[PDB]
Amino acid sequence: IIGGRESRPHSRPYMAYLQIQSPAGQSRCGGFLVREDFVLTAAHCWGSNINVTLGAHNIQRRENTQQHITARRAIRHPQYNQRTIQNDIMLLQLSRRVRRNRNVNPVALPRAQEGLRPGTLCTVAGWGRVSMRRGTDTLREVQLRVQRDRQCLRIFGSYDPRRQICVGDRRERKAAFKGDSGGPLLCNNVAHGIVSYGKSSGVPPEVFTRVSSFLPWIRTTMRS
Numbered sequence: 001i002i003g004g005r006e007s008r009p010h011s012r013p014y015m016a017y018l019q020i021q022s023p024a025g026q027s028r029c030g031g032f033l034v035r036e037d038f039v040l041t042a043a044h045c046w047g048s049n050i051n052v053t054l055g056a057h058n059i060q061r062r063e064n065t066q067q068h069i070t071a072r073r074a075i076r077h078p079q080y081n082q083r084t085i086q087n088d089i090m091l092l093q094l095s096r097r098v099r100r101n102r103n104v105n106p107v108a109l110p111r112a113q114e115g116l117r118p119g120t121l122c123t124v125a126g127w128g129r130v131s132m133r134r135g136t137d138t139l140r141e142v143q144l145r146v147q148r149d150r151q152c153l154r155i156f157g158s159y160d161p162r163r164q165i166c167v168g169d170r171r172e173r174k175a176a177f178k179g180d181s182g183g184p185l186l187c188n189n190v191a192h193g194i195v196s197y198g199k200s201s202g203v204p205p206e207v208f209t210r211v212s213s214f215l216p217w218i219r220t221t222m223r224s
């Protein structure tokens with residue numbers, strides 16, 4: 001998170017920290033609990049081995065509030081295209097159900113096809129980098145304004161306004177960044193987006209996956 005603030009501890013109990021590929025420090029991503037047995041995140045974060053940490057604030061400490069679970073299944077969206085980064089969404093079925101409590105619980109999702117008006121203020125959270133040189137051990141968050149789709153349609157090649165969201169006013173140094181991938185974009189406290197990608201500089205507008213266009217698939221995949 002660039003230009004944000006440290007989050008009040010445990011104020012976003014749905015936050016999940018992902019470590020992809022056993023090797024400690026091999027790859028980091030964010031995600032969010034949607035049910036006691038499922039975590040939603042980005043498909044470009046896929047790996048053969050994913051360790052999930054729920055209930056954390058400082059992910060570099062084995063906190064009493066944490067619950068550690070491995071991804072039993074890492075289900076990439078069937079039409080995920082890593083080259084164009086389209087359909088960047090993935091469901092992680094946890095090896096075991098979390099014990100739901102004040103520090104670990106699901107987040108509300110948008111209804112099917114729910115959109116977002118440009119100018120709306122949303123919040124994204126994560127343990128990603130705060131700059132090219134600095135990262136963070138603790139959860140941070142920042143408020144960003146939804147942008148008109150035309151901006152991302154000009155900047156990013158394959159953008160689809162139905163399946164993606166254009167976020168971040170270029171006039172402010174605030175945005176989700178490297179390591180925040182997979183994390184949620186909360187608009188009116190509902191998880192409308194998943195951090196997908198943006199410029200390597202971190203200067204917005206940036207692209208989020210629009211959760212509301214994938215409800216049928218999410219439903220089906222979870223209706224196991």
Ligand SMILES: CN(C(=O)c1cc2ccccc2cc1C(=O)[C@@H](c1cccc2ccccc12)P(=O)(O)O)C1CCN(C(=O)c2ccc3ccccc3c2)CC1
Pocket residue numbers: 028029044045085155156157175176177178179180181195196197198199200201202206207
């Ligand atoms: C150097 N970068 C970044 O520092 C970066 C910037 C971001 C800016 C805003 C929001 C999220 C961001 C995530 C990252 C990453 O490095 C991700 C990461 C690692 C490896 C492969 C990935 C494949 C798809 C999505 C995330 C990926 P990571 O977070 O998973 O580690 C990323 C910039 C975006 N990328 C592009 O090809 C890309 C595509 C079209 C573009 C069009 C215009 C300008 C830049 C463009 C850059 C990938 C690497």
